[PDB]
C-alpha cells in the first residue's frame, strides 16, 4: 500500500492491471521444483529450484510476480495455502495474539516486503484445472520434468 503501509488486499481484480497466472510444482522424492508465471500481456518466466516443497514453489511464484510487476498487480494462484498464509499475515498485521507461521517464514516475509512496496494487489485462488487458459499454461511450464501432467 501507498507509503510502506498495511493496506488490505483488493476485494476484486484491478481493472486495467496486468494479470500474472502464477504456479509452482515440486517433486517430493527429489525436492526439485519450478516456479513461474505467464501474463495476459504475454510475459512469462520460469525458474528452477532445489531443496523445495510444493508450498514453497507456490510462494516463490507469487514472489516472482510481485518482483516483476508494476504498482498494481492481479495475481491468480491455485494454492489456497499461499493465498491464506499471505492474507492472514496482512489481516493480522502487527497485533499481539497473532503468532508467526512455523514454516516458510523467510519466504513469506520476502513476499510481505514486496507487497508493502505495491499500491494495489489482488490475489485470487482458482482450483487447478484443464483448458487452454492462464493457470493451465503456467501449470505446464513448471510441471515439465517435475511431475506428470
Ligand atoms: O502445486 C500444486 S500441488 C500443490 N502445491 N501446493 C499445493 C497446495 C496448497 C494448498 C493449500 C490448501 C488447499 C490446496 C492446496 O498444492 C499444483 C497442482 C496443480 C497445479 N496447477 O494446475 O497448477 S499446481
Ligand atoms: Mn499450483
Ligand atoms: Mn500446477
Ligand atoms: Zn540441494
Ligand atoms: Zn495505481
Ligand atoms: Zn528482502
Give the pairing type, strands 72-77 and 19-27: parallel
C-alpha distances in angstroms, 118 versus 2, 19, 66?
7, 14, 8
Q: Would you state the cell numbers that stand for residue 55, as one nine-digit string? A: 508450498
Spatial CA neighbour of 52 closest among 17, 25, 16: 25
C-alpha distances in angstroms, 59 versus 16, 64, 95, 103, 138?
24, 9, 24, 12, 14
User: Domains of the chain, with CATH numbers?
Assistant: 19-143 (3.30.420.10)
Cα(131) to centroid(ligand 2), Å: 15
Give the other-Cβ count within 10 Å of 134's Cβ.
19
Long-range contacts of 106-110 (CB under 8 A, 24+ apart): 107/56, 107/59, 107/60, 107/63, 108/59, 110/63
Q: Contact 90/8 with Cβ under 8 angstroms?
A: yes
* Collapsed DSSP state (helix, strand, coil) of residue 86: helix
Method of determination used here: X-ray
Q: Whose C-alpha lies nearest to ligand 1, atom 14?
A: 80
CA angle in degrees (0–180, nearest 5) for 122-123-127: 140
Tell me which DSSP letter residue 1 carries. -
Cα(20) to centroid(ligand 1), Å: 16
Query: What does the alpha-carbon distance between residue 124 and residue 126 come to, in Å, rounded to a whole number?
Result: 7
Spatial CA neighbour of 14 closest among 98, 107, 120, 125: 120
Q: Contact 37/20 with Cβ under 8 angstroms?
A: yes
Give the residue, out of 21, 58, 139, 146, with the most ligand 1 atoms within 8 A of its beta carbon, to mutate for a pocket test: 58
Spatial CA neighbour of 146 closest among 22, 52, 45: 52
Query: What does the alpha-carbon distance between residue 114 and residue 76 come to, in Å, rounded to a whole number?
Result: 17
- Please enumerate in sequence order all residues whose Cβ is within 8 A of that of 137, keeping only pairs 6 or more positions apart, or say none: 21, 38
**Adjacency order of strands within the sheet including 32-39:** 44-49, 32-39, 19-27, 72-77, 120-125
Q: Would you state the cell numbers that stand for residue 65, as one nine-digit string? A: 510476480
DSSP string, 106-149: HHHHHHHHHHHT-SEEEEEE-----SSSHHHHHHHHHHTTTS--
Amino acid at each position: 500500500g501507498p507509503g510502506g503501509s498495511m493496506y488490505q488486499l483488493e476485494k476484486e481484480p484491478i481493472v486495467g492491471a496486468e494479470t500474472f497466472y502464477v504456479d509452482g510444482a515440486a517433486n517430493r522424492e527429489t525436492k526439485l521444483g519450478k516456479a513461474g508465471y505467464v501474463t495476459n500481456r504475454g510475459r512469462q518466466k520460469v525458474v528452477t529450484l532445489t531443496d523445495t516443497t510444493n508450498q514453497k514453489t507456490e510462494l516463490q511464484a507469487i514472489y516472482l510476480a510481485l518482483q516483476d510487476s508494476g504498482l498494481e498487480v492481479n495475481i491468480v494462484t491455485d494454492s489456497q495455502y499461499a493465498l491464506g498464509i499471505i492474507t492472514q499475515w496482512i489481516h493480522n498485521w502487527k497485533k499481539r495474539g497473532w503468532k508467526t507461521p512455523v514454516k516458510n517464514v523467510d519466504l513469506v516475509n520476502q513476499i510481505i516486503e514486496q507487497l508493502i512496496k505495491k499500491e494495489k494487489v489482488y490475489l485470487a485462488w482458482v482450483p487447478a484445472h484443464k483448458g487452454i487458459g492462464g493457470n493451465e499454461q503456467v501449470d505446464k511450464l513448471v510441471s515439465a520434468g517435475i511431475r506428470k501432467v
